[PDB]
Scaffold this active site. Structure first.
Site, PDB file in Angstrom:
ATOM      1  N   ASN A  92       0.830  -1.195   0.000  1.00  0.00           N
ATOM      2  CA  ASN A  92       0.000   0.000   0.000  1.00  0.00           C
ATOM      3  C   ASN A  92       0.868   1.248   0.000  1.00  0.00           C
ATOM      4  O   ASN A  92       1.932   1.276   0.623  1.00  0.00           O
ATOM      5  CB  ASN A  92      -0.935   0.027   1.219  1.00  0.00           C
ATOM      6  CG  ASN A  92      -0.257   0.571   2.462  1.00  0.00           C
ATOM      7  OD1 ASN A  92      -0.273   1.776   2.713  1.00  0.00           O
ATOM      8  ND2 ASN A  92       0.343  -0.316   3.249  1.00  0.00           N
ATOM      9  N   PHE A 134      -1.205   8.763   4.183  1.00  0.00           N
ATOM     10  CA  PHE A 134      -1.939   9.459   5.237  1.00  0.00           C
ATOM     11  C   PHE A 134      -3.142  10.219   4.676  1.00  0.00           C
ATOM     12  O   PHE A 134      -3.283  11.432   4.843  1.00  0.00           O
ATOM     13  CB  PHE A 134      -1.017  10.412   6.005  1.00  0.00           C
ATOM     14  CG  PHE A 134      -0.027   9.725   6.910  1.00  0.00           C
ATOM     15  CD1 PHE A 134      -0.164   8.387   7.248  1.00  0.00           C
ATOM     16  CD2 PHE A 134       1.040  10.434   7.435  1.00  0.00           C
ATOM     17  CE1 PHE A 134       0.749   7.772   8.085  1.00  0.00           C
ATOM     18  CE2 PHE A 134       1.954   9.825   8.270  1.00  0.00           C
ATOM     19  CZ  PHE A 134       1.807   8.492   8.596  1.00  0.00           C
ATOM     20  N   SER A 157       5.710   5.342   9.040  1.00  0.00           N
ATOM     21  CA  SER A 157       5.096   5.209   7.724  1.00  0.00           C
ATOM     22  C   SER A 157       6.163   5.336   6.642  1.00  0.00           C
ATOM     23  O   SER A 157       6.978   6.265   6.689  1.00  0.00           O
ATOM     24  CB  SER A 157       4.017   6.268   7.517  1.00  0.00           C
ATOM     25  OG  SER A 157       3.608   6.306   6.159  1.00  0.00           O
ATOM     26  N   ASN A 210       5.395   5.912   3.450  1.00  0.00           N
ATOM     27  CA  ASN A 210       4.734   6.537   2.312  1.00  0.00           C
ATOM     28  C   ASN A 210       4.646   8.053   2.426  1.00  0.00           C
ATOM     29  O   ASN A 210       4.002   8.689   1.585  1.00  0.00           O
ATOM     30  CB  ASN A 210       3.335   5.942   2.141  1.00  0.00           C
ATOM     31  CG  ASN A 210       3.366   4.438   1.979  1.00  0.00           C
ATOM     32  OD1 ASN A 210       4.264   3.895   1.339  1.00  0.00           O
ATOM     33  ND2 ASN A 210       2.392   3.755   2.567  1.00  0.00           N
ATOM     34  N   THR A 211       5.265   8.648   3.441  1.00  0.00           N
ATOM     35  CA  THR A 211       5.412  10.097   3.516  1.00  0.00           C
ATOM     36  C   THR A 211       6.899  10.406   3.645  1.00  0.00           C
ATOM     37  O   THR A 211       7.529   9.987   4.633  1.00  0.00           O
ATOM     38  CB  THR A 211       4.617  10.690   4.685  1.00  0.00           C
ATOM     39  OG1 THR A 211       4.650  12.122   4.610  1.00  0.00           O
ATOM     40  CG2 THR A 211       5.176  10.247   6.023  1.00  0.00           C
ATOM     41  N   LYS A 231       4.775   3.600  17.372  1.00  0.00           N
ATOM     42  CA  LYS A 231       4.817   2.547  16.366  1.00  0.00           C
ATOM     43  C   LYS A 231       6.146   2.642  15.625  1.00  0.00           C
ATOM     44  O   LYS A 231       6.478   3.695  15.071  1.00  0.00           O
ATOM     45  CB  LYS A 231       3.644   2.672  15.397  1.00  0.00           C
ATOM     46  CG  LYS A 231       3.492   1.488  14.463  1.00  0.00           C
ATOM     47  CD  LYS A 231       2.164   1.532  13.726  1.00  0.00           C
ATOM     48  CE  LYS A 231       1.962   0.285  12.886  1.00  0.00           C
ATOM     49  NZ  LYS A 231       0.627   0.259  12.232  1.00  0.00           N
ATOM     50  N   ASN A 268       5.093  -1.541  11.727  1.00  0.00           N
ATOM     51  CA  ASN A 268       4.407  -1.014  10.558  1.00  0.00           C
ATOM     52  C   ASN A 268       4.809  -1.851   9.342  1.00  0.00           C
ATOM     53  O   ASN A 268       5.287  -2.980   9.481  1.00  0.00           O
ATOM     54  CB  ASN A 268       4.736   0.473  10.396  1.00  0.00           C
ATOM     55  CG  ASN A 268       3.585   1.269   9.810  1.00  0.00           C
ATOM     56  OD1 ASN A 268       2.847   0.780   8.955  1.00  0.00           O
ATOM     57  ND2 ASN A 268       3.425   2.504  10.272  1.00  0.00           N
TER      58      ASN A 268
HETATM   59  C1  FMN Z   1      -3.674  -0.367   3.037  1.00  0.00           C
HETATM   60  C2  FMN Z   1      -2.938  -0.209   4.337  1.00  0.00           C
HETATM   61  C3  FMN Z   1      -3.016   1.010   4.998  1.00  0.00           C
HETATM   62  C4  FMN Z   1      -2.353   1.200   6.203  1.00  0.00           C
HETATM   63  N1  FMN Z   1      -2.444   2.419   6.837  1.00  0.00           N
HETATM   64  C5  FMN Z   1      -1.793   2.624   8.033  1.00  0.00           C
HETATM   65  C6  FMN Z   1      -1.895   3.855   8.672  1.00  0.00           C
HETATM   66  O1  FMN Z   1      -2.561   4.757   8.170  1.00  0.00           O
HETATM   67  N2  FMN Z   1      -1.246   4.066   9.868  1.00  0.00           N
HETATM   68  C7  FMN Z   1      -0.500   3.050  10.426  1.00  0.00           C
HETATM   69  O2  FMN Z   1       0.080   3.234  11.493  1.00  0.00           O
HETATM   70  N3  FMN Z   1      -0.400   1.826   9.797  1.00  0.00           N
HETATM   71  C8  FMN Z   1      -1.044   1.601   8.599  1.00  0.00           C
HETATM   72  N4  FMN Z   1      -0.945   0.374   7.966  1.00  0.00           N
HETATM   73  C9  FMN Z   1      -0.127  -0.726   8.590  1.00  0.00           C
HETATM   74  C10 FMN Z   1      -1.038  -1.677   9.362  1.00  0.00           C
HETATM   75  O3  FMN Z   1      -1.527  -1.006  10.505  1.00  0.00           O
HETATM   76  C11 FMN Z   1      -0.324  -2.953   9.803  1.00  0.00           C
HETATM   77  O4  FMN Z   1       0.837  -2.614  10.526  1.00  0.00           O
HETATM   78  C12 FMN Z   1       0.050  -3.828   8.611  1.00  0.00           C
HETATM   79  O5  FMN Z   1      -1.097  -4.048   7.814  1.00  0.00           O
HETATM   80  C13 FMN Z   1       0.638  -5.172   9.027  1.00  0.00           C
HETATM   81  O6  FMN Z   1      -0.332  -5.949   9.688  1.00  0.00           O
HETATM   82  P1  FMN Z   1      -0.915  -7.250   8.946  1.00  0.00           P
HETATM   83  O7  FMN Z   1       0.222  -8.130   8.483  1.00  0.00           O
HETATM   84  O8  FMN Z   1      -1.823  -8.014   9.880  1.00  0.00           O
HETATM   85  O9  FMN Z   1      -1.681  -6.754   7.745  1.00  0.00           O
HETATM   86  C14 FMN Z   1      -1.602   0.172   6.762  1.00  0.00           C
HETATM   87  C15 FMN Z   1      -1.525  -1.050   6.100  1.00  0.00           C
HETATM   88  C16 FMN Z   1      -2.184  -1.246   4.891  1.00  0.00           C
HETATM   89  C17 FMN Z   1      -2.066  -2.584   4.219  1.00  0.00           C
HETATM   90  O1  OG6 Z   2       2.065   3.693   8.688  1.00  0.00           O
HETATM   91  C1  OG6 Z   2       1.651   3.511   7.556  1.00  0.00           C
HETATM   92  C2  OG6 Z   2       1.038   4.509   6.716  1.00  0.00           C
HETATM   93  C3  OG6 Z   2       0.620   4.177   5.480  1.00  0.00           C
HETATM   94  C4  OG6 Z   2      -0.040   5.163   4.509  1.00  0.00           C
HETATM   95  O2  OG6 Z   2      -0.821   5.980   5.008  1.00  0.00           O
HETATM   96  O3  OG6 Z   2       0.301   5.018   3.322  1.00  0.00           O
HETATM   97  N1  OG6 Z   2       0.770   2.912   5.007  1.00  0.00           N
HETATM   98  C5  OG6 Z   2       1.333   1.892   5.713  1.00  0.00           C
HETATM   99  O4  OG6 Z   2       1.457   0.768   5.274  1.00  0.00           O
HETATM  100  N2  OG6 Z   2       1.749   2.256   6.968  1.00  0.00           N
END
Ligand code: FMN
Ligand code: OG6
Ligand code: A1A6D
Length: 369
Positions: free
Chosen positions: A113, A117, A184, A186-187, A232, A261
């Site tokens: 992904n 944000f 993150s 992605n920023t 995190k 993350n």
């Molecule tokens: C599409 C997507 C968006 C995410 N957005 C955030 C986010 O906005 N903030 C954050 O701290 N983590 C974000 N994450 C990370 C998830 O919180 C998590 O750490 C990650 O999916 C790994 O867990 P999993 O293996 O069970 O999927 C995102 C992950 C995905 C796949």
């Molecule tokens: O902490 C984060 C944030 C994002 C996102 O907003 O793009 N995506 C992640 O996979 N982890």
């Protein structure tokens, strides 16, 4: 439950033909109108867990980035999760990177992904959470659930601490805990903030603003207490940096640390080649669990761990718990297993402690060591 299983049928169709974000939007739309399944069964009192004075009714929540705007809290919690981490939010709204920005490899149960944000902003999300807390006051199925808020910075912001203050000042009195997202991918330039000095100032400033909310009932949340502070961490660090971070967290007195993350170092998924963003799912499991083992030692067991990364089964969860985690967050498991995620993994975890002779979940933390 008759309701959970009906959604399993559409799950494989969605993962095969539908775009990921449409699936995300639909899920948020289902829960917005309270037509998602419910799990009103009692949870095992021997599976309950806690981080300091935060009491979790069970060890499974939803990780940040699923309900980034807090518009779907009630229905998600009622799927059988004990808590949800909304966000990551920023002071000003953001649309995020261009779409498509979410891609799934069903075979490897992995996701990549590049959201960037995307969120309504602090003000609007604060409104949404205030609305949830009002509904919580009148719904028994929500009285013991916990809501944490992950906070971050706009892409155009220069100093992170300035944005973190705004979030604390507006949504701080409605959160059960604050998660500092400095991981993150992605920023641009965020992960650089994990350097000890900058992270130290970040944690002190975040913890200072929360303590200063009192000076200037106050806590309109579940605990009626001030929110705890969590950080995190990203997994793509070297060992010396992890040592500094551990020293900072303990010194600054962090209430916990989420691990972890997404990661950027995985390059063996054929459908994800040459794609930007962080990778989630199973392939991140073993990597993240070690980050807990490492950090858990570097912290000398003094900082609780929250597990996030590739947790799909009750055993995957016990691996995180025995490694040193006190509670687990799901994200990909929800994507690939659907509405049944919480029920299936709670049943599997209870079955596991029975066979292994544990009295309760608390006995399992760090038993691997
Ligand atoms: C599409 C997507 C968006 C995410 N957005 C955030 C986010 O906005 N903030 C954050 O701290 N983590 C974000 N994450 C990370 C998830 O919180 C998590 O750490 C990650 O999916 C790994 O867990 P999993 O293996 O069970 O999927 C995102 C992950 C995905 C796949
Ligand atoms: O902490 C984060 C944030 C994002 C996102 O907003 O793009 N995506 C992640 O996979 N982890
Ligand atoms: C298939 N699916 N894909 C997803 C995705 O890509 N995300 C984004 C964050 C990265 N979030 C959730 C995603 C789901 C999800 N399993 C889902 C969506 C829609 C339906 C249906 F059929 F009702 F419409 C179903 Cl049954 C199940 C959702 C419940 C967790």
């Amino acid at each position: 439950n008759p309701e959970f299983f009906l959604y399993d049928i559409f799950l494989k169709f969605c993962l095969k033909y539908i775009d990921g974000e449409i699936c995300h939007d639909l899920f948020l739309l289902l829960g917005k109108y309270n037509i998602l399944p419910y799990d009103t069964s009692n949870d095992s009192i021997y599976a309950c867990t806690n981080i300091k004075h935060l009491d979790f009714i069970n060890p499974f929540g939803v990780a940040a980035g699923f309900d980034k705007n807090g518009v779907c809290i009630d229905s998600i919690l009622k799927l059988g999760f004990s808590f949800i981490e909304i966000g990551t939010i920023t002071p000003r709204g953001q649309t995020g990177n261009a779409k498509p920005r979410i891609f799934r490899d069903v075979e490897s149960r992995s996701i990549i992904n590049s959201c960037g944000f995307n969120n309504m902003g602090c003000d609007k999300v604060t409104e949404n959470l205030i609305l949830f807390r009002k509904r919580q006051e009148e719904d028994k199925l929500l009285s013991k659930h916990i809501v944490g808020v992950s906070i971050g910075k706009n892409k155009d912001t220069v100093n992170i601490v300035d944005d973190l203050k705004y979030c604390i000042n507006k949504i701080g009195r409605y959160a059960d805990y604050i998660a500092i997202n400095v991981s993150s991918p992605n920023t641009p330039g965020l992960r650089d903030n994990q350097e000890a000095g900058k992270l130290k100032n970040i944690i002190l400033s975040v913890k200072e603003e929360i303590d200063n909310l009192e000076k200037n009932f106050l806590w309109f949340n579940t605990t009626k207490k001030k929110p705890l502070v969590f950080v995190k961490l990203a997994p793509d660090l070297n060992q010396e940096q992890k040592k500094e971070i551990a020293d900072v967290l303990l010194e600054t007195n962090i209430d916990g640390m989420i691990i972890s993350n997404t990661t950027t170092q995985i390059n063996d998924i054929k459908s994800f080649e040459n794609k930007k963003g962080g990778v989630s799912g199973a392939k991140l499991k073993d990597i993240s669990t070690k980050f807990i083992c490492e950090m858990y030692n570097y912290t000398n067991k003094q900082i609780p761990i929250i597990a996030s990364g590739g947790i799909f089964s009750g055993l995957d969860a016990l691996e995180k718990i025995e490694a040193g985690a006190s509670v687990c967050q799901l994200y990909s498991c929800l994507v690939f297993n659907g509405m049944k995620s919480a029920v299936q993994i709670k049943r599997e975890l209870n079955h596991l402690l029975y066979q292994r002779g544990y009295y309760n979940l608390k006995e399992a933390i760090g038993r691997k060591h």
